[PDB]
Amino acid sequence: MSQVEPGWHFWLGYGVDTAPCNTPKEKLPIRAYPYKFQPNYTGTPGAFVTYNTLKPKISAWEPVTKQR
Amino acid sequence: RPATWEESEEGALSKATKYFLLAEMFRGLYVVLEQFFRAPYTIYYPFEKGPVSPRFR
Ligand SMILES: CCCCCCCCCCCCCCCCCC(=O)OC[C@H](COP(=O)(O)OCCN)OC(=O)CCCCCCCCCCCCCCCCC
C-alpha cells in the first residue's frame, strides 16, 4: 500500500471525487525542488536511520600548551 | 398481578406444539439463512480502501 503515490492514495480512499490527473492546474502544488516518490523501506537497507541534528551543547577546549 | 396457567388464552396442545417443534428457534435459523443470500460488506484491502476524510489524523 505504500507504493501508491500521494494524491492517488487520497482518491482511492474516496477522499476526493476527481483523480489527480484530472485536477486543474490551480489546485496543484508548486515545487521549487524535484519531486521524488519513495515507498516504505522498512526491513531493508534503505530503512530510515535517525540521528541528532545538533552538535553537542557544550564544546570542549582545544588544549594548547604555552612556554613559561 | 402475574397470570396463572389456568387463565391462559392458548390451549395446552398449541403450547406443546411450539415447545416440541422449536418454533422460535426455527424463525431464528431462517433469519440467519436470509443473510446468506445478501451482499457481504468486505473490501479487498490493500486493493481497495476504506473511507478517508480531509480531517483524518
Ligand atoms: C405436541 C405433541 C408433541 C408430542 C411429543 C413430541 C414428539 C417429539 C418432538 C421432536 C422434538 C423434540 C425434541 C425437542 C424438545 C425440546 C423441548 C425444549 O424446549 O427443551 C427446553 C429445555 C429447557 O427445559 P424446560 O424447563 O422444559 O423449558 C422451560 C424454560 N423456561 O431447554 C432446551 O433444551 C432448549 C431446546 C433444545 C434445542 C436444541 C437446539 C440444537 C440445534 C437445533 C436443531 C434445529 C434444527 C437444525 C436443523 C437445521 C434446520 C433445517
Side-chain angles (χ1 to χ4, degrees):
Chain A
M1 180 48 87
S2 69
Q3 288 149 7
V4 179
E5 177 193 20
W8 286 108
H9 173 279
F10 207 55
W11 178 88
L12 187 63
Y14 307 89
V16 282
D17 274 355
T18 165
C21 37
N22 293 33
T23 61
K25 260 38 136 163
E26 278 132 0
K27 299 191 179 186
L28 285 208
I30 322 179
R31 300 185 152 94
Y33 54 92
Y35 179 69
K36 55 143 149 196
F37 173 61
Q38 292 171 278
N40 193 343
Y41 296 134
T42 201
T44 258
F48 169 55
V49 180
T50 204
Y51 53 89
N52 185 0
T53 57
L54 308 173
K55 71 222 280 163
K57 322 268 182 67
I58 304 309
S59 98
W61 177 58
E62 169 32 60
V64 166
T65 72
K66 187 177 177 183
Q67 285 281 4
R68 332 200 181 137
Chain B
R1 185 150 185 179
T4 69
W5 71 269
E6 97 167 28
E7 50 187 337
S8 89
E9 49 154 4
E10 294 166 330
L13 198 47
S14 287
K15 287 214 305 295
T17 307
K18 281 150 136 132
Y19 170 84
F20 282 108
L21 298 170
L22 321 172
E24 97 281 13
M25 306 213 75
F26 274 114
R27 199 177 157 114
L29 280 156
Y30 196 73
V31 164
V32 164
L33 181 62
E34 280 209 77
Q35 305 281 92
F36 184 81
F37 299 91
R38 286 183 187 170
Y41 292 109
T42 317
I43 74 181
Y44 289 63
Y45 186 86
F47 304 91
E48 299 158 342
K49 198 177 165 44
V52 77
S53 96
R55 294 173 193 192
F56 179 81
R57 313 193 302 256

